[PDB]
Amino acid sequence: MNPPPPETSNPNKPKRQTNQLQYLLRVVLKTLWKHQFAWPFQQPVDAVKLNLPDYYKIIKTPMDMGTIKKRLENNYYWNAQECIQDFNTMFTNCYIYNKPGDDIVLMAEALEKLFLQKINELPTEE
Numbered sequence: 001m002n003p004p005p006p007e008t009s010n011p012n013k014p015k016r017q018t019n020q021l022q023y024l025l026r027v028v029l030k031t032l033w034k035h036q037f038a039w040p041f042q043q044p045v046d047a048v049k050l051n052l053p054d055y056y057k058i059i060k061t062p063m064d065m066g067t068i069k070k071r072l073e074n075n076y077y078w079n080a081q082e083c084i085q086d087f088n089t090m091f092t093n094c095y096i097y098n099k100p101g102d103d104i105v106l107m108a109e110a111l112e113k114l115f116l117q118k119i120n121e122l123p124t125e126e
């Protein structure tokens, strides 16, 4: 069985909409979301359909771009670093669970290269 997905809504968590967070949605997430390798990362890993009974025994902090997209659209974050960590968690989970040469790993690295190139020009806070 799959665990419940990460939280995307929490009304007692403080939130805001900084220009950095707008950039993470409009530049960073949109760039990765449209990429040819985005599809495995657009929703939580469905370990049941994929028949990976051990995935959520090894991956204790799941994350994915569907969760990140909902969080940005919901203005769930307080700062840019919370959102950047989610991306890095999602990439790291992939490298942690899988074999170094795997397709899913190459897909992850292609998205992460773009991720790094975009956050390198993260604007200073307005």
Ligand SMILES: COc1cc(OC)c2c(=O)cc(-c3cc(C)c(OC[C@H](O)CN4CCN(C)CC4)c(C)c3)oc2c1
Pocket (backbone or CB within 6 Å): 039, 040, 041, 045, 046, 050, 051, 052, 093, 094, 097, 098, 104
């Ligand atoms: C869709 O979205 C995502 C997103 C993901 O991360 C974002 C991942 C991910 O992390 C890795 C896997 C995955 C890994 C193996 C190893 C596998 O293969 C298991 C199969 O039973 C056959 N192999 C078993 C091992 N035997 C040695 C050889 C055969 C399958 C089907 C998927 O899928 C993902 C899908």
